[PDB]
Tab-separated table of C-alpha atoms and ligand atoms in Angstrom:
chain	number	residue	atom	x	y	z
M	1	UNK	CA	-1.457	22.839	-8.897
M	2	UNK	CA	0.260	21.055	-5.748
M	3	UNK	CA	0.270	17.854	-5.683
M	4	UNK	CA	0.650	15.744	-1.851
M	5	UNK	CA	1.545	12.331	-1.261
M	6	UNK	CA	-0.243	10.838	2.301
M	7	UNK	CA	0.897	7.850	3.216
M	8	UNK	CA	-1.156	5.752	5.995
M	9	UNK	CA	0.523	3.855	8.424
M	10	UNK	CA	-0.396	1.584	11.365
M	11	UNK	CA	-1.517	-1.911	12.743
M	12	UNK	CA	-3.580	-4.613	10.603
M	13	UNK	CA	-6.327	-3.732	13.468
M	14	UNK	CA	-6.983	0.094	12.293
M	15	UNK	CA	-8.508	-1.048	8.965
M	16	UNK	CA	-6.460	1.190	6.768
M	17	UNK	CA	-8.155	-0.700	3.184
M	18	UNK	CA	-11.108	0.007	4.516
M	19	UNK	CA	-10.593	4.167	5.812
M	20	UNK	CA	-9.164	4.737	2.545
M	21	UNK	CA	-11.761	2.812	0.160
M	22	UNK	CA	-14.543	4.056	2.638
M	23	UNK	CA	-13.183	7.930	2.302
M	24	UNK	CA	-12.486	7.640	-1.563
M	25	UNK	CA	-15.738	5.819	-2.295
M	26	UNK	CA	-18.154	8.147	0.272
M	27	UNK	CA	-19.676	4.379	1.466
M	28	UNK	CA	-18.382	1.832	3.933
M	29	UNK	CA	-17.765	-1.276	1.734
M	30	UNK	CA	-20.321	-3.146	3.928
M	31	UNK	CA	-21.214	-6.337	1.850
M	32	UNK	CA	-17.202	-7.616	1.130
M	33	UNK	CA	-13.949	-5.295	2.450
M	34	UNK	CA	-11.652	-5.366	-0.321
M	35	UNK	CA	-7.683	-6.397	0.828
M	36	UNK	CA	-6.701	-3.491	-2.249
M	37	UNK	CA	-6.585	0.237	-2.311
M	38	UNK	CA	-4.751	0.867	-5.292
M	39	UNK	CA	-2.031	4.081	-5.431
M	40	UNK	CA	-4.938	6.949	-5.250
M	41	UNK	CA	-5.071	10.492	-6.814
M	42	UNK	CA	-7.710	12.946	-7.419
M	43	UNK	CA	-8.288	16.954	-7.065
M	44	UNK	CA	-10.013	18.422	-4.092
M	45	UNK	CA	-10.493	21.911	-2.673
M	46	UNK	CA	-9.435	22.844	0.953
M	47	UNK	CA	-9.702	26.690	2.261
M	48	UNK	CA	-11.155	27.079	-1.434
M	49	UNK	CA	-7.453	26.519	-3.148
M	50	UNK	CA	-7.841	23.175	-5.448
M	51	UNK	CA	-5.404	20.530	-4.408
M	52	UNK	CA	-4.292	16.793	-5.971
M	53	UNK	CA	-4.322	14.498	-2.658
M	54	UNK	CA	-2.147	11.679	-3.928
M	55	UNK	CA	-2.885	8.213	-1.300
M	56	UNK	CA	-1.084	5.439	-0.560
M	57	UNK	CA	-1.819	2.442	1.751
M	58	UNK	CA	0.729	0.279	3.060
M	59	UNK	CA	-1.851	-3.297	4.046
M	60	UNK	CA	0.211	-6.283	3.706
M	61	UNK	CA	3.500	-4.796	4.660
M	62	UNK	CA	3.090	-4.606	8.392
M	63	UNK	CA	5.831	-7.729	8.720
M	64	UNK	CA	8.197	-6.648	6.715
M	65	UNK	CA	9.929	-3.808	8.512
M	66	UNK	CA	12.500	-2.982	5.698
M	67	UNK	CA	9.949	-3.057	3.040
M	68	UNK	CA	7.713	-0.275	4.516
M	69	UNK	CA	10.237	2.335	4.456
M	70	UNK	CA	10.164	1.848	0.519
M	71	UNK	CA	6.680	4.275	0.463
M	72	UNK	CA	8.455	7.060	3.165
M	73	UNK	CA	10.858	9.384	1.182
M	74	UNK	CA	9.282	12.243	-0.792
M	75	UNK	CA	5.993	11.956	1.536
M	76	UNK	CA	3.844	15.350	2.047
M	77	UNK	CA	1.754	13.993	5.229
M	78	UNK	CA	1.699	10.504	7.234
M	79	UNK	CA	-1.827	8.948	8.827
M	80	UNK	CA	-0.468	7.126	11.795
M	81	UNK	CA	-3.548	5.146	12.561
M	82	UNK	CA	-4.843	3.519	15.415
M	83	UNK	CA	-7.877	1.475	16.479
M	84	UNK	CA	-9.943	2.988	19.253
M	85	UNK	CA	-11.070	-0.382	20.446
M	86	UNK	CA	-7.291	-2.033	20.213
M	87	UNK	CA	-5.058	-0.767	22.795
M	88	UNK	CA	-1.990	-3.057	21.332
M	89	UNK	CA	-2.661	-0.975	18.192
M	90	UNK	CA	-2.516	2.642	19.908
M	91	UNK	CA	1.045	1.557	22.236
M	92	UNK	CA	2.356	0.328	17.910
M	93	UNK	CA	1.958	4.247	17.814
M	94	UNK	CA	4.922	4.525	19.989
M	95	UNK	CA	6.822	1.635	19.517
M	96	UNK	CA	6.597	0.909	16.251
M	97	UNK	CA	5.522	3.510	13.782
M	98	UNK	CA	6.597	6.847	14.630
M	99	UNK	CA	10.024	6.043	15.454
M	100	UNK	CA	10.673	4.385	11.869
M	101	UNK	CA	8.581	7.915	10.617
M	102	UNK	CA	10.655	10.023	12.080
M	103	UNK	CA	14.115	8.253	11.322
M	104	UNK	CA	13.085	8.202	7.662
M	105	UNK	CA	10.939	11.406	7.402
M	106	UNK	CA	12.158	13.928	10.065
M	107	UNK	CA	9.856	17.061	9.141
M	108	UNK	CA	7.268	15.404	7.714
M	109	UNK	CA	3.743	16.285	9.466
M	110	UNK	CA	1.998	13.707	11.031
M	111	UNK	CA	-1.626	13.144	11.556
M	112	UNK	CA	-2.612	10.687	14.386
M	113	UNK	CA	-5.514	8.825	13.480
M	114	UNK	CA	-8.168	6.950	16.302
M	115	UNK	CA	-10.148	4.548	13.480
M	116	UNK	CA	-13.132	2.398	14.492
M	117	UNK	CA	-14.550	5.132	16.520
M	118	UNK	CA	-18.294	3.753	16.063
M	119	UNK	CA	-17.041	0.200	18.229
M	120	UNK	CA	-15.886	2.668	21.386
M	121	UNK	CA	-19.427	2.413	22.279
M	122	UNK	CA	-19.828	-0.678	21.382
M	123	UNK	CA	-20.930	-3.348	24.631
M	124	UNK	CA	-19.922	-6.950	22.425
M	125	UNK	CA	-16.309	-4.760	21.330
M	126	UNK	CA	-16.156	-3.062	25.191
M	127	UNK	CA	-17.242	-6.395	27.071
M	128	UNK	CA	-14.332	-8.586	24.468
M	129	UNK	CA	-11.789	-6.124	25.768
M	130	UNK	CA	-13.053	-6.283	29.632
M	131	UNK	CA	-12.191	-9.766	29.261
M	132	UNK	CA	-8.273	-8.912	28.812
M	133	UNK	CA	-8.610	-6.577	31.451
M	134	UNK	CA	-8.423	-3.853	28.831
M	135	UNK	CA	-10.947	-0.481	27.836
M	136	UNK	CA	-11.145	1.444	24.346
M	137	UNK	CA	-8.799	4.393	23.575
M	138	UNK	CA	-10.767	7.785	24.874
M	139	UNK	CA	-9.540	11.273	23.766
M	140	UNK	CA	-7.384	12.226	26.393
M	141	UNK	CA	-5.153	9.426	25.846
M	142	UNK	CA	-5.242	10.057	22.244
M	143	UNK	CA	-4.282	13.757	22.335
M	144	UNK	CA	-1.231	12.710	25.143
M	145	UNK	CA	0.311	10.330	22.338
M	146	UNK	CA	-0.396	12.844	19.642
M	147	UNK	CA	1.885	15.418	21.760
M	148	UNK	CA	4.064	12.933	22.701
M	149	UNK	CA	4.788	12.473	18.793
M	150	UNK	CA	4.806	15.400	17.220
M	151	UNK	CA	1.362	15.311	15.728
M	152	UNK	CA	-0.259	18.290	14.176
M	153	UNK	CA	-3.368	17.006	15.064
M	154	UNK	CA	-5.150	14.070	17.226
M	155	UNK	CA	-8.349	13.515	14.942
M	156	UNK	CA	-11.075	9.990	15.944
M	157	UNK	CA	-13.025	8.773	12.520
M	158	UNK	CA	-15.415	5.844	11.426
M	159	UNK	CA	-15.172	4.357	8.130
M	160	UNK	CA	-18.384	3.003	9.347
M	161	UNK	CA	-20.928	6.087	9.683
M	162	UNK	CA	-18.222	8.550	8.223
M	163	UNK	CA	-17.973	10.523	11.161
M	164	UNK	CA	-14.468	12.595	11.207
M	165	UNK	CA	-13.339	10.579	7.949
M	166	UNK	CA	-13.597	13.696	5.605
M	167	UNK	CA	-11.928	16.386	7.877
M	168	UNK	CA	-8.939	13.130	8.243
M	169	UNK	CA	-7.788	13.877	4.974
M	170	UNK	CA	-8.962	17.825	4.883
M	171	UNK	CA	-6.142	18.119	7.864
M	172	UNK	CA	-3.703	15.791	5.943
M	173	UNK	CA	-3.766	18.632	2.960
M	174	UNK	CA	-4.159	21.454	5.940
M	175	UNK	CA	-0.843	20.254	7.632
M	176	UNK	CA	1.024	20.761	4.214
M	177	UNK	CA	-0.471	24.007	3.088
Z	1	UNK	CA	-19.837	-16.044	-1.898
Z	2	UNK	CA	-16.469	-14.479	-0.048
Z	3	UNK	CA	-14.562	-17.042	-1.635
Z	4	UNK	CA	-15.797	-15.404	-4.961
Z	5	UNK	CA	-15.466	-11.731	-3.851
Z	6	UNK	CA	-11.671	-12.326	-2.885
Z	7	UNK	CA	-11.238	-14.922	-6.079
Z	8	UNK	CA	-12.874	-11.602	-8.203
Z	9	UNK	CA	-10.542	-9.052	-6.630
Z	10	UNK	CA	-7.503	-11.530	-6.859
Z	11	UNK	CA	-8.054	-11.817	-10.584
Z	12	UNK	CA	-9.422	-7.569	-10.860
Z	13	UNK	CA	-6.398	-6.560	-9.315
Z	14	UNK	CA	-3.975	-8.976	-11.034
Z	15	UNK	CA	-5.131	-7.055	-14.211
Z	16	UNK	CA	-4.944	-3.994	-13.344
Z	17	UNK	CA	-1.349	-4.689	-11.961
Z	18	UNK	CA	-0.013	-5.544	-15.377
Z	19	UNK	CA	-1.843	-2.949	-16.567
Z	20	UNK	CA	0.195	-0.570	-14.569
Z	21	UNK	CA	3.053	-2.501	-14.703
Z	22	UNK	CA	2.637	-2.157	-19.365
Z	23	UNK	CA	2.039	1.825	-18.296
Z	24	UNK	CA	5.169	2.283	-16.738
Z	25	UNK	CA	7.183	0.320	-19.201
Z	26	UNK	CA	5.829	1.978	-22.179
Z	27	UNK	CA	5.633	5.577	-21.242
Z	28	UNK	CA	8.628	6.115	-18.260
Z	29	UNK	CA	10.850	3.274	-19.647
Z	30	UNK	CA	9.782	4.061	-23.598
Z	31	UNK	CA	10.867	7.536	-23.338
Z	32	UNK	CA	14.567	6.869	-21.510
Z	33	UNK	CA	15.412	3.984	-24.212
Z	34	UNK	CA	13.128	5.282	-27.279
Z	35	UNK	CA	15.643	8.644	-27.789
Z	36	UNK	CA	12.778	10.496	-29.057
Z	37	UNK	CA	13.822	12.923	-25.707
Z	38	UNK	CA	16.845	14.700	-24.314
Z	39	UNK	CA	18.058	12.637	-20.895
Z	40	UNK	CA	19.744	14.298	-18.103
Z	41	UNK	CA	23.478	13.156	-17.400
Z	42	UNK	CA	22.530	11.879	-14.492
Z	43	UNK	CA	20.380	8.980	-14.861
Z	44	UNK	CA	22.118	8.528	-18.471
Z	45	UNK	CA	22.466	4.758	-19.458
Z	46	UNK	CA	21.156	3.987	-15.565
Z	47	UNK	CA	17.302	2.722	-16.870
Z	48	UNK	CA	18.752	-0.793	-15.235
Z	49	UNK	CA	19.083	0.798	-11.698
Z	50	UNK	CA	15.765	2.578	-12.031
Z	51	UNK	CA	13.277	-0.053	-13.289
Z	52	UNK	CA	15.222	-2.514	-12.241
Z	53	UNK	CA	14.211	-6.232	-13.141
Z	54	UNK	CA	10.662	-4.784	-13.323
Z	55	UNK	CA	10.340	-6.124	-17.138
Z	56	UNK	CA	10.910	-9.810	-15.763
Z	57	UNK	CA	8.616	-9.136	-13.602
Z	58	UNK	CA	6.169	-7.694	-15.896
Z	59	UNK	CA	7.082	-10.660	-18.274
Z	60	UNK	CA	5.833	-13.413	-16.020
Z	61	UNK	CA	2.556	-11.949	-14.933
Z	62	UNK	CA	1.628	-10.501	-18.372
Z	63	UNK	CA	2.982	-13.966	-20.086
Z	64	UNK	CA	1.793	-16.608	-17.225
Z	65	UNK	CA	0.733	-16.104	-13.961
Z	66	UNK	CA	-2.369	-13.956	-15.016
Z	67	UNK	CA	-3.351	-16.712	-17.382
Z	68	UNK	CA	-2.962	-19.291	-14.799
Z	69	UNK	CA	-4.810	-17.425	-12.076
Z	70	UNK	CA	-7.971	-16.977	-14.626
Z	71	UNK	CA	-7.977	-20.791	-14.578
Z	72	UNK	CA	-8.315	-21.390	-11.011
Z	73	UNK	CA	-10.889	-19.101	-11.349
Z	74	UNK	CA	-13.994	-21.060	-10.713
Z	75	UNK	CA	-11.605	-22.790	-8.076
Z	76	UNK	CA	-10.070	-20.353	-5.162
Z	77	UNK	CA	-9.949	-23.177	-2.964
Z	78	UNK	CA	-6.957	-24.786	-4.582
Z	79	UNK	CA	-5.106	-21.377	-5.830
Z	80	UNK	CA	-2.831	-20.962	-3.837
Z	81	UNK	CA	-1.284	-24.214	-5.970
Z	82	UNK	CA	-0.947	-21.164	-8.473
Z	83	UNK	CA	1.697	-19.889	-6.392
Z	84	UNK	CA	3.329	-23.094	-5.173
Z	85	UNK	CA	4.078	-24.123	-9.072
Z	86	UNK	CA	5.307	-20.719	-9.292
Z	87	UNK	CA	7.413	-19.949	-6.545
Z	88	UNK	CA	10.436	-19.653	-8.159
Z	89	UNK	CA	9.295	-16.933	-10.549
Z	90	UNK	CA	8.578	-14.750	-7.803
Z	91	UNK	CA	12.371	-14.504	-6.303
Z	92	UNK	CA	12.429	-11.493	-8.824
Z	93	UNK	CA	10.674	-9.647	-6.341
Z	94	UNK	CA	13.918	-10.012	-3.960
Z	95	UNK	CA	16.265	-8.504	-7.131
Z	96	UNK	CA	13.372	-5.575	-7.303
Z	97	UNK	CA	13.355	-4.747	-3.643
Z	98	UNK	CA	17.299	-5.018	-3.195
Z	99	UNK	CA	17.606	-2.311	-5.714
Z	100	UNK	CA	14.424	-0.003	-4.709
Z	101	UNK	CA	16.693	2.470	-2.338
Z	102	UNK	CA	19.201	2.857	-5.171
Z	103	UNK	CA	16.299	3.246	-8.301
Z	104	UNK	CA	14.804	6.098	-5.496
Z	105	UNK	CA	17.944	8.281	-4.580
Z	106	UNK	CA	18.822	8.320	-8.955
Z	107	UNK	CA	15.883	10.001	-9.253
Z	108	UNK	CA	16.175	12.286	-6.058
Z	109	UNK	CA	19.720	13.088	-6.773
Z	110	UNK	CA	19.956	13.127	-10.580
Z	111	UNK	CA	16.289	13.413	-13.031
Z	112	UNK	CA	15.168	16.962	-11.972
Z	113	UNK	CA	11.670	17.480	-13.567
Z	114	UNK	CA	12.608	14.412	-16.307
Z	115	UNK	CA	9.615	12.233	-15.545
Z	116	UNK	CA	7.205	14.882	-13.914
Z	117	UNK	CA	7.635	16.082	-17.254
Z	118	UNK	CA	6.879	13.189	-19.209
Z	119	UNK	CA	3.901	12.207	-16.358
Z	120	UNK	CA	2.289	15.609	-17.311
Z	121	UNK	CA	3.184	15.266	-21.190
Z	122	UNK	CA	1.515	11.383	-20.590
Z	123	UNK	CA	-1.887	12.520	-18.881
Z	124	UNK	CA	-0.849	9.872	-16.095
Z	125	UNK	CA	-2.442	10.183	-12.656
Z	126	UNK	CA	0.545	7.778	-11.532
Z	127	UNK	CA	4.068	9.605	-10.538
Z	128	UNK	CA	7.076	7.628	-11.528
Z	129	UNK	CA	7.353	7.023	-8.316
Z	130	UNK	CA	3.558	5.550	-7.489
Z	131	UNK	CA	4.600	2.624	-10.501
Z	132	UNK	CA	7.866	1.466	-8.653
Z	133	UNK	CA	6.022	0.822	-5.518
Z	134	UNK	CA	3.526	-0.953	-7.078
Z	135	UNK	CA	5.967	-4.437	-7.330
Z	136	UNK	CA	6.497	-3.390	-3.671
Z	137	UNK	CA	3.107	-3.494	-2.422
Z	138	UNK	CA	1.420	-6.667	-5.050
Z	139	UNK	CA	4.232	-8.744	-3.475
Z	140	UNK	CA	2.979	-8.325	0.010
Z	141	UNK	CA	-0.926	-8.437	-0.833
Z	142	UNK	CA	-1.176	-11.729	-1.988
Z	143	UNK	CA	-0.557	-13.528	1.667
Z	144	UNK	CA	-3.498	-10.861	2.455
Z	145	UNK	CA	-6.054	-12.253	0.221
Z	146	UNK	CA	-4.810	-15.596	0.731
Z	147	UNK	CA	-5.547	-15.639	4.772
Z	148	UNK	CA	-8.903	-14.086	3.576
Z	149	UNK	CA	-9.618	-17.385	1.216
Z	150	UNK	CA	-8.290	-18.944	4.900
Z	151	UNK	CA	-10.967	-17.924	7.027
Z	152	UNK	CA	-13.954	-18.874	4.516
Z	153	UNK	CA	-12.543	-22.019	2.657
Z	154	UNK	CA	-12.787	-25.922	4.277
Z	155	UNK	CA	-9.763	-28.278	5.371
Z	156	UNK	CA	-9.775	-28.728	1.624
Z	157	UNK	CA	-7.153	-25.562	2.292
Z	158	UNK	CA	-3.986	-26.795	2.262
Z	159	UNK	CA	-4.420	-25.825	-1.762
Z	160	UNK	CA	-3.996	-22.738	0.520
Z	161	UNK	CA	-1.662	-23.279	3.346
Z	162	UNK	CA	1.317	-24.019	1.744
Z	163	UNK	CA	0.489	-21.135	-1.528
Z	164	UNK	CA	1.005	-18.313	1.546
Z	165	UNK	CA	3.850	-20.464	3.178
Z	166	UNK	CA	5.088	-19.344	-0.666
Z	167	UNK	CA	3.716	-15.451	-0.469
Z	168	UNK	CA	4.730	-15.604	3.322
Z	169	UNK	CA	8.440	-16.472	2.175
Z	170	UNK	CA	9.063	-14.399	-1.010
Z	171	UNK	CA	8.580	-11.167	0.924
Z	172	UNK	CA	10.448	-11.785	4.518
Z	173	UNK	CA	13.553	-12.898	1.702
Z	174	UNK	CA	13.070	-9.913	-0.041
Z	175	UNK	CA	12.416	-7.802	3.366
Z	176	UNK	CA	15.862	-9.665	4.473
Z	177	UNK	CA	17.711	-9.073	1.240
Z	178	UNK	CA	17.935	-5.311	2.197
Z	179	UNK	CA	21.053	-3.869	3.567
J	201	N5D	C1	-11.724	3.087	9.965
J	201	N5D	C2	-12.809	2.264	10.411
J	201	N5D	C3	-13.951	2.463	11.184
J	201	N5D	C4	-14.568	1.221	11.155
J	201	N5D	N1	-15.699	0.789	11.770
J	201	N5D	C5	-16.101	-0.591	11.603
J	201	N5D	O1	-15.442	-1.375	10.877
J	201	N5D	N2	-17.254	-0.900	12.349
J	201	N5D	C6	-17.886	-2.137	12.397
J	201	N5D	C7	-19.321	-2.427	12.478
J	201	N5D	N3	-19.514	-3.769	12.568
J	201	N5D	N4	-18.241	-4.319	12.522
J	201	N5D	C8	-18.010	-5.751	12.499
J	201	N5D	C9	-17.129	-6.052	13.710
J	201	N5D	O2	-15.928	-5.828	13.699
J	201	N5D	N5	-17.780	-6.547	14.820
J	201	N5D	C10	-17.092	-6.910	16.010
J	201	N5D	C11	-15.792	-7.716	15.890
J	201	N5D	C12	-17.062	-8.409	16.315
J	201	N5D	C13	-17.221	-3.361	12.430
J	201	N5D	N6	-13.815	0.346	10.377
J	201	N5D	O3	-12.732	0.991	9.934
């Protein structure tokens, strides 16, 4: 049975504990977010041929820029993640984690990732960032950086209301397949 | 209350960290020193470069710093004395992370299907490779859930402050130990 390593990437801001316990658990924390997602595996079926999605998040490291690379070799699939609702987050697509992806991991598929979807609509989150004279992420501009990467796919998820969080990791095996 | 949630998952995932930690040791590292199994060439004699100074490491949580955390468990406030007094223990972590690259490529470039093997043999959900990290990634989440102690703990925190000065500084030296 194949087994795929998926390791997520990106900002402090996109909430990548949270995706990954809120995906593996099927429930958004809610009460306390947990700083720990511990190395993940388990069996799931995608185009109806059984799979073991192997997970790793990389919280914690997002200062050390010679640590990270540690978790790259032997990857199946990245996550570059983004917030939606943090702008400095989605430009850290392009200046910080895809070029340190692809130096490490040339032909690895990447995933880009718009987290937090359920604040894009949000008028406290919108009117905070009107107040730096910034707006959320919208689709366009997600699908431009996607091309502009090398991204198999552009996908926007909640860990929130689980809204595009299960067909996340669905495209992660999909993009290995 | 989120004083005690982080204080809980501190000490839950402190356990379960030399849990893994024992795993490793005692299934990869038992089966390259026990000779109960035949051991390609190429990592022959090498268990040093793979695991690296992960026993030491091992050693101090399993011996001490789990037992000490436990006790500061009905105080998070003042924990991050915890890793003040023990500061010096966690310099391993720079030896570990130096040598990471090199344990990696040895297995790459010279184990074939040695520890896949024993992983399936094992039962173990955890590759080889998902143990080594582990070192990696506990040695950067402890400034984590100390900022989170931070935001919800009075200016009786700097029993705080100067414990992530600590798990602020182990990491950037081992980050700036690599070549
Ligand atoms: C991935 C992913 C999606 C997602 N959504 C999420 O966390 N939504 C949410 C709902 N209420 N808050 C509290 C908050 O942040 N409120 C505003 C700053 C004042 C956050 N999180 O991770």
């Amino acid at each position: 049975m194949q087994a795929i390593k998926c390791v997520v990437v990106g900002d402090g801001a996109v909430g990548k504990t949270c995706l990954l316990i809120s995906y593996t658990t099927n429930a958004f924390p809610g009460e306390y977010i947990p700083t720990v997602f511990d190395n993940y595996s388990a069996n799931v079926m995608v185009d109806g041929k059984p799979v073991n999605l192997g997970l790793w998040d990389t919280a914690g490291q997002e200062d050390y820029d010679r640590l990270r690379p540690l978790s790259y070799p032997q990857t199946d699939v990245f996550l570059i993640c983004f917030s939606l609702v943090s702008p400095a987050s989605f430009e850290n697509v392009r200046a910080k984690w895809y070029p340190e992806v692809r130096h490490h991991c040339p032909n690895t598929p990447i995933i880009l990732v718009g987290t937090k979807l359920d604040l894009r609509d949000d008028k406290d989150t919108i009117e905070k960032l009107k107040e730096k004279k910034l707006t959320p992420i919208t689709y366009p501009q997600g699908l431009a950086m996607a091309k502009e990467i090398g991204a198999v796919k552009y996908l926007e998820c909640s860990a929130l209301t689980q809204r595009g969080l299960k067909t996340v990791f669905d495209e992660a095996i999909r993009a290995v397949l | 209350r989120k004083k005690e949630f982080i204080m809980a998952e501190l000490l839950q995932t402190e356990k379960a960290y030399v849990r893994d930690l024992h795993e490793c040791l005692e299934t990869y590292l038992w089966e390259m020193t026990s000779g109960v199994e035949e051991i390609p060439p190429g990592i022959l004699n090498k268990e040093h470069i793979i695991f690296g100074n992960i026993q030491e490491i091992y050693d101090f949580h399993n011996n001490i710093f789990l037992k000490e955390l436990e006790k500061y468990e009905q105080l998070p406030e003042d924990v991050g004395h915890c890793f003040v007094t023990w500061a010096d223990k966690f310099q391993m972590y720079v030896t570990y992370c130096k040598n990471k690259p090199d344990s990696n490529q040895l297995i790459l470039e010279h184990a074939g299907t040695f520890f896949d093997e024993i992983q399936q043999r094992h039962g173990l959900a955890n590759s080889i490779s998902s143990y080594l990290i582990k070192p990696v990634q506990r040695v950067t989440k402890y400034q984590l859930l100390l900022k989170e102690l931070l935001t919800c703990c009075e200016e009786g925190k700097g029993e705080l402050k100067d414990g992530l000065e600590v798990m602020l500084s182990v990491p950037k030296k081992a980050n700036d130990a690599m070549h």
